[PDB]
Design a protein around this ligand. Structure first.
Ligand SMILES: [Mg+2]
Ligand SMILES: [Mg+2]
Ligand SMILES: [Mg+2]
Ligand SMILES: [Mg+2]
Ligand SMILES: [Mg+2]
Ligand SMILES: [Mg+2]
Ligand SMILES: [Mg+2]
Ligand SMILES: [Mg+2]
Ligand SMILES: [Mg+2]
Ligand SMILES: [Mg+2]
Ligand SMILES: [Mg+2]
Ligand SMILES: [Mg+2]
Ligand SMILES: [Mg+2]
Ligand SMILES: [Mg+2]
Ligand SMILES: [Mg+2]
Ligand SMILES: [Mg+2]
Ligand SMILES: [Mg+2]
Ligand SMILES: [Mg+2]
Ligand SMILES: [Mg+2]
Ligand SMILES: [Mg+2]
Ligand SMILES: [Mg+2]
Ligand SMILES: [Mg+2]
Ligand SMILES: [Mg+2]
Ligand SMILES: [Mg+2]
Ligand SMILES: [Mg+2]
Ligand SMILES: [Mg+2]
Ligand SMILES: [Mg+2]
Ligand SMILES: [Mg+2]
Ligand SMILES: [Mg+2]
Ligand SMILES: [Mg+2]
Ligand SMILES: [Mg+2]
Ligand SMILES: [Mg+2]
Ligand SMILES: [Mg+2]
Ligand SMILES: [Mg+2]
Ligand SMILES: [Mg+2]
Ligand SMILES: [Mg+2]
Ligand SMILES: [Mg+2]
Ligand SMILES: [Mg+2]
Ligand SMILES: [Mg+2]
Ligand SMILES: [Mg+2]
Ligand SMILES: [Mg+2]
Ligand SMILES: [Mg+2]
Ligand SMILES: [Mg+2]
Ligand SMILES: [Mg+2]
Ligand SMILES: [Mg+2]
Ligand SMILES: [Mg+2]
Ligand SMILES: [Mg+2]
Ligand SMILES: [Mg+2]
Ligand SMILES: [Mg+2]
Ligand SMILES: [Mg+2]
Ligand SMILES: [Mg+2]
Ligand SMILES: [Mg+2]
Ligand SMILES: [Mg+2]
Ligand SMILES: [Mg+2]
Ligand SMILES: [Mg+2]
Ligand SMILES: [Mg+2]
Ligand SMILES: [Mg+2]
Ligand SMILES: [Zn+2]
Lengths: 68, 105, 208, 157
RNA sequence: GUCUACGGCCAUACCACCCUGAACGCGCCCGAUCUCGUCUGAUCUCGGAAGCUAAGCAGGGUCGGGCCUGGUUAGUACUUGGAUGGGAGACCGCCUGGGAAUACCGGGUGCUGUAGGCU
RNA sequence: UAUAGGGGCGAAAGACUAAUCGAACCAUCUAGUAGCUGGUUCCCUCCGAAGUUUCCCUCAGGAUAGCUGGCGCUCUCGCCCACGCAGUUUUAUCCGGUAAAGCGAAUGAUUAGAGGUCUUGGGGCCGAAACGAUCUCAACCUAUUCUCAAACUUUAAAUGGGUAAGAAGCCCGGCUCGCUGGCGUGGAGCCGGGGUGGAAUGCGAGUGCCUAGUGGGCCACUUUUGGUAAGCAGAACUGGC
RNA sequence: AAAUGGAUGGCGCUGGAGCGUCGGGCCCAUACCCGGCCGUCGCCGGCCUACGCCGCGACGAGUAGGAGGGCCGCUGCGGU
RNA sequence: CUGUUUAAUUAAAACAAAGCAUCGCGAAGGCCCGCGGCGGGUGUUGACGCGAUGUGAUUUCUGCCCAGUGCUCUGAAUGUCAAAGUGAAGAAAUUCAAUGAAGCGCGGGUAAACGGCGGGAGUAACUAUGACUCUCUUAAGGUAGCCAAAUGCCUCGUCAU
RNA sequence: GGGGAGUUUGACUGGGGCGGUACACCUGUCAAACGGUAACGCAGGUGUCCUAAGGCGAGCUCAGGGAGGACAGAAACCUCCCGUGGAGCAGAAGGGCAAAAGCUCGCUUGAUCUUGAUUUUCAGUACGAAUACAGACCGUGAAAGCGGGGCCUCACGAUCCUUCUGACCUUUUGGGUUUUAAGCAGGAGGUGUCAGAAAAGUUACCACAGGGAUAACUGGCUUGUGGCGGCCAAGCGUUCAUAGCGACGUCGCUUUUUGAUCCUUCGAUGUCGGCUCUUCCUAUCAUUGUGAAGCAGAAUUCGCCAAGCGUUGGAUUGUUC
RNA sequence: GCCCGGAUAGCUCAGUCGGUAGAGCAGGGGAUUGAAAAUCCCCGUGUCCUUGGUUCGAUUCCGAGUCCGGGCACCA
């Protein structure tokens, strides 16, 4: 009662049927796992961007449109 | 192994390192009128013999050692348990060694 | 003693007498030089050696029989101390025996099948010298006849060459006497010490 | 049955090679790792805290995270039927930059300068990389001497 | 053409021995009352400056040892792929491409950054 | 006439008990159970495998991945240049410690000669004896020499493995930050603006669900482990059956 | 040198029908090419059962298995 | 010995058997059956009986072990000790303690109860063999007898016929 | 309390049993220069040990050798010089380490509490181990920092149930108070068949479903072992290598010994030996024809063509022998 | 062939608790007896089988051999 124990034959020819493609990798990669201190920085950074970035950036857009 | 008697360690009640009495854990006398014990006697009564399996093949000859800790400060009195690795031989708190010693065997 | 037909062509990896074997018996050969061991360099100009043609194993008992046959023909042919013979090839590979009838079926099958150490063989590459006999210029036929009588006692096919080199050293016999006469090669027993000229000057001052 | 623990095929791979045993030189530490760099991973036996694995030796990945004294890399590792982008945390002592991306940035900057000068002066500079062309019809010289005659040599041993 | 302080590469910059060093500088050196620490002011710490380049140090040298690099080794050993190639087998030869190491021989033996100072 | 089935009877053979007995016969529970054999009924078209990973009182079996098919869906084409991809090459750039080679380079084994005079013990000789003097021996050291290594190595291939070869990229200007901090400093994010012609070759790609069968393999070149060897057992790369 | 009588396949074959080196012709597979026919697939076209009709081009092996079509078939039921 | 047995493969050396032993029991008992009752059987019986075994005529014999394993006798002798009962704490559920039937362990007997019964070293005026002597050792170390047998591997043991 | 009843009797496996654990977890190698990759392959380990052998800081440098010094000797103590790991780091090896990860000393508990992410095994599940952080509260150091066990790779364990700890926690069923019980969160009590059933034996009185996935008999490949040969020639042979033999070695053949393997048959190929009977082989015992001898004759021995024809009667043992 | 159990004065043998070499017997020495045994008073006797690791130390704890000694070697 003895059988062939382990092999890796006929494995590459199975793997390359559908193809060994890459893992997609879309834009704006997943941001979990990054440094919590940096993340606590960047969240308040974003919400205060969206808070105070109206007036002076609108001024600078008017200024750069007047220049060009 | 060998642990000391007093050992300043964090206790969660008063949020600081406080000194602790360190004693040996006792398993505690198991009690009748618990849930599993009442279920075990309810299923054990009647003509059924041994329902739940009793254990035979004990292989681990060592037991993990856990320590009872007490905050030495009055009216805090927080107890908690902490584990060490396995050991065959254990002493509580005495006989620390020296390196300038002659044996005399 | 199993027949040497099976212990032949180099199949398994080299397995030396070492830390991991620990039970191999002694090799058959123990000495390696038979002639005038203390011969100086110019006492024997030529050498004839024996080139292997095949890639195979040679057993220590075969080397033992071959050096004895060549020794006996030399001392009958050109007298004692008229030759210096050297077996350049040493046995270090250790062969294995998984012996049975240890007559019935009932001991074991092929279950525990890593054999015990049988003995020692010597691995040969193609073009490697087995024996080298350094003799006088007059002894050219005796060397050929001796290595012919050893050729039958080794297995396989291998040929016999008469070297271009002086002595056992690696220098040409034509350049040898012309170059030892003045400058470089100082004789050292049976060996020859080469000198470069990129040394400290104490060597050149100790010379001349 | 090959005793599948960490770091088993590494009698040679995590070794400091030769005449280089000792303290780590500090130019490995004093480098700047920004998010988006491309780094090589190479094992160092002297610093035993944050060695990656025996799998990721020589693999080249992307940096996405920076901490006090380590760095998090994304590395394409092949497993059985598909390749995956994993996320490793490696200390700084095992890491160096790939020079490939810096060479490509030099290519990009030369291409931008040639593009600006070409739009300036109307020249068509052909700023792509052409592969090795066949040899042009050159014109050899045999002055003074007939060509040397070669023949196969007679065998000796 | 140099040194000091901090360095980067980490022996082309080590090791052995022999020469030379003007000015600053580093030292060697003279002493323990405070700071200090020892069995011991030898080491560590502290107040200096009578001497000295003898040593470290710095430069040079050794048909120097080592290192680095380049030839020879050698298209040799090996090797991806191929053949209704040879061979009883062992292995070997060929087409296709790639291609190494020791003895042997020749050459070198620190280069630099920042701040500071002497000719 | 008595003894009736886990019962009877047996001068004991586990024999006999209606041709059945190491637990009789008949009916019912009952279409009991089975990872185990056997069979499993019309045509044509299209696509088309696996005998492998892990876990299991698992090793003739199942679950799990992988392979397959069906159902689609979301985009791309048609009217000096595209999106994306690749069992491929090139151009760069890293990585390895095998083939080979090496021992006058560490470790491990190992052959032989020569030189030297410290150290002894041992032989001989001058001698009452004396490192008093001398010859010899071994050991030792010095440069040499022959051969090696799956559990040695300075060196070190060919084949190979990863990454890159651009608009998700450059470059400019500004806002925000409780993070960092000599510094309006660093780093991220956000906004607005500016210029796509960035190796070779080939192609349509991306994505979701459901799930059958499979979980007994074998051979061939080459590399390889055990064995004397095998049409033997066991592996690797590729192909085939 | 091996047990029934037998195997370069046999018959045979020696200026070859043997060995090695080669040449010029010649034979043929479902391979290739050309041409016809069937089906699948794709790309369409027409305001002609639109579930039909033609057109173009590339391809068709196959067990375990999976789908699609069948104006294939047996027996019965409502409608015709 | 006569006898009997596996009908349908065995006829025996097996089985029984007389003889020899051994053990329980004085009827409110032994040994059994029975779902049940003082219901049956031995029993219409009473130790020259009934019940349960071992061995197997006569003749001659019945060795040595109570360590193991059984069996049995003994005493609340004293450790272990289950319900119920007692006492205590508690609002109560509950908890604790003391007391402690059989049995187990402690002690005595039994082998015609199951069963078991050693190995070394030296040693005699030719050599061998060795009565004797010393030592470890178990509870006891195979005694009377008997044999290569139906039991002896080596084995076709050695000698005689 | 086997008088009676029910049930169990691991798995791997060059057949099974016996033997072993290759049944969990580590090191080197096989491993074919990324990773992965097997056998009852090799060479080994583990079911621990540590109040320090952990953490930090400071000082110092080891093994070994040479040279010297009362008792001192091969080995006691001291001092100098050389000393790139030849030592030590708890342990099996490998890696790594020299103003150190080693030795000594001073402080000490970071071997503490808590959420996550990721690696490792991998199905991209878990336990275990580990990495990098985050927030407390600390130790150390002048400070930079280091530290959340052991310089790194092994040292360990689910559900259920018990047990202990934590909150002025929840529910304890018509509403209250208290006991008790249940619950949340995290530690231990074990599953070594180590991702975890609670488990003895025998069948020769056996039964059933199956397997040639799997032994005993033949057949086939193989030839160690058995048997039969060949080459070389140290010798033996009164002298003399080869009339006859021939060691030390060496290359083959045979399937009449035994072994290895499991390819065929487990819905059956009737298994030893003997009796009888036919045919074939030659590696020739005798006969025909020959050659050589250490062949005087005789009697022998060794070769060649040669299987035509012979190769018996008995005591024993079932025998082949 | 596996699998266990060993080795110690001249001989039987213990002691192992990693730090001790011990009993009995034999040999040797006296006394006692005319003289032998026996007795009484004493002695000496070991590489703790060999080669290696851990330890501060190996007669002992392990690793490897030597020479012994038990047990298994079954279905067919
Ligand atoms: Mg299988
Ligand atoms: Mg009850
Ligand atoms: Mg033979
Ligand atoms: Mg003072
Ligand atoms: Mg002081
Ligand atoms: Mg001073
Ligand atoms: Mg000086
Ligand atoms: Mg000077
Ligand atoms: Mg030089
Ligand atoms: Mg210099
Ligand atoms: Mg019944
Ligand atoms: Mg009947
Ligand atoms: Mg049915
Ligand atoms: Mg049925
Ligand atoms: Mg399975
Ligand atoms: Mg699909
Ligand atoms: Mg390797
Ligand atoms: Mg090699
Ligand atoms: Mg299906
Ligand atoms: Mg599936
Ligand atoms: Mg199956
Ligand atoms: Mg080839
Ligand atoms: Mg195979
Ligand atoms: Mg097979
Ligand atoms: Mg023929
Ligand atoms: Mg088809
Ligand atoms: Mg009857
Ligand atoms: Mg009959
Ligand atoms: Mg009665
Ligand atoms: Mg009688
Ligand atoms: Mg008796
Ligand atoms: Mg008693
Ligand atoms: Mg009570
Ligand atoms: Mg009494
Ligand atoms: Mg006698
Ligand atoms: Mg007797
Ligand atoms: Mg029963
Ligand atoms: Mg089994
Ligand atoms: Mg690999
Ligand atoms: Mg590889
Ligand atoms: Mg020094
Ligand atoms: Mg190490
Ligand atoms: Mg320090
Ligand atoms: Mg922290
Ligand atoms: Mg209620
Ligand atoms: Mg109520
Ligand atoms: Mg498991
Ligand atoms: Mg049974
Ligand atoms: Mg019977
Ligand atoms: Mg088969
Ligand atoms: Mg068979
Ligand atoms: Mg049949
Ligand atoms: Mg039949
Ligand atoms: Mg028949
Ligand atoms: Mg005939
Ligand atoms: Mg033993
Ligand atoms: Mg003795
Ligand atoms: Zn507290």
């Amino acid at each position: 009662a003895k059988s062939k124990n382990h092999t890796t034959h006929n494995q590459s020819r199975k793997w390359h049927r559908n193809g060994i493609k890459k893992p997609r990798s879309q834009r704006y990669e997943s941001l979990k796992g990054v440094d919590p201190k940096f993340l606590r920085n960047m969240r308040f950074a974003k919400k205060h961007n969206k808070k105070g970035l109206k007036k002076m950036q609108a001024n600078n857009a008017k200024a750069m449109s007047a220049r060009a | 192994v060998n642990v000391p008697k007093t050992r300043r360690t964090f206790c969660k009640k008063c949020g600081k390192h406080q000194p602790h009495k360190v004693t040996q854990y006792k398993k505690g006398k198991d009690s009748l009128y618990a849930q599993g014990k009442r279920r075990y006697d309810r299923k054990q009564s009647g003509y059924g013999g041994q329902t739940k399996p009793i254990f035979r093949k004990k292989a681990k000859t060592t037991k993990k050692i856990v320590l009872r800790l007490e905050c030495v400060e009055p009216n805090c009195r927080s107890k908690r348990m902490l584990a060490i690795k396995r050991c065959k031989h254990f002493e509580l708190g005495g006989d620390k060694k020296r390196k300038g010693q002659v044996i005399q065997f | 003693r199993r027949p040497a037909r099976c212990y032949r062509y180099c199949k398994n990896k080299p397995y030396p007498k070492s830390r991991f074997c620990r039970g191999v018996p002694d090799a058959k050969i123990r000495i390696f030089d038979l002639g005038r061991k203390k011969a100086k360099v110019d006492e024997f100009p030529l050498c004839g050696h024996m080139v292997s043609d095949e890639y195979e194993q040679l057993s220590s008992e075969a080397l033992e029989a071959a050096r004895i046959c060549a020794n006996k023909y030399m001392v009958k042919s050109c007298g004692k101390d008229g030759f210096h013979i050297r077996v350049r090839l040493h046995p270090f590979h250790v062969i294995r025996i998984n012996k049975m009838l240890s007559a019935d079926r009932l001991q074991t099958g092929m279950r525990g099948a890593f054999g015990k150490p049988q003995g020692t063989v010597a691995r040969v590459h193609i073009g490697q010298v087995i024996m080298s006999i350094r003799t006088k210029l007059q002894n050219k036929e005796h060397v050929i006849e001796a290595l012919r009588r050893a050729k039958f006692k080794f297995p396989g096919r291998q040929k016999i060459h008469i070297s271009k080199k002086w002595g056992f050293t690696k220098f040409n016999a034509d350049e040898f006497e012309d170059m030892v006469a003045e400058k470089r090669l100082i004789p050292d027993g049976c060996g020859v010490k080469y000198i470069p000229n990129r040394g400290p000057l104490d060597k050149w001052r100790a010379l001349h | 049955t090959n005793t599948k623990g960490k770091r088993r095929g590494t009698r040679y791979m995590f070794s400091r090679p030769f005449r280089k045993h000792g303290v780590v030189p500090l130019a490995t530490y004093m480098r700047i790792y920004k998010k988006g760099d491309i780094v090589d991973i190479k094992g160092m036996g002297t610093v035993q805290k944050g060695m990656p694995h025996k799998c990721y030796h020589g693999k080249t990945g992307r940096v996405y995270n920076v901490t006090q004294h380590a760095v998090g890399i994304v590395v394409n590792k092949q497993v059985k039927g598909k390749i995956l982008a994993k996320r490793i945390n490696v200390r700084i002592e095992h890491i160096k930059h790939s020079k490939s991306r810096d060479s490509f940035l030099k290519r990009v900057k030369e291409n931008d300068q040639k593009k600006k000068e070409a739009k300036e002066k109307g020249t068509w500079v052909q700023l792509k990389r052409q592969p090795a062309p066949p040899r042009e019809a050159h014109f050899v010289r045999t002055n003074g001497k007939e060509p040397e005659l070669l023949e196969p040599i007679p065998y000796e041993f």
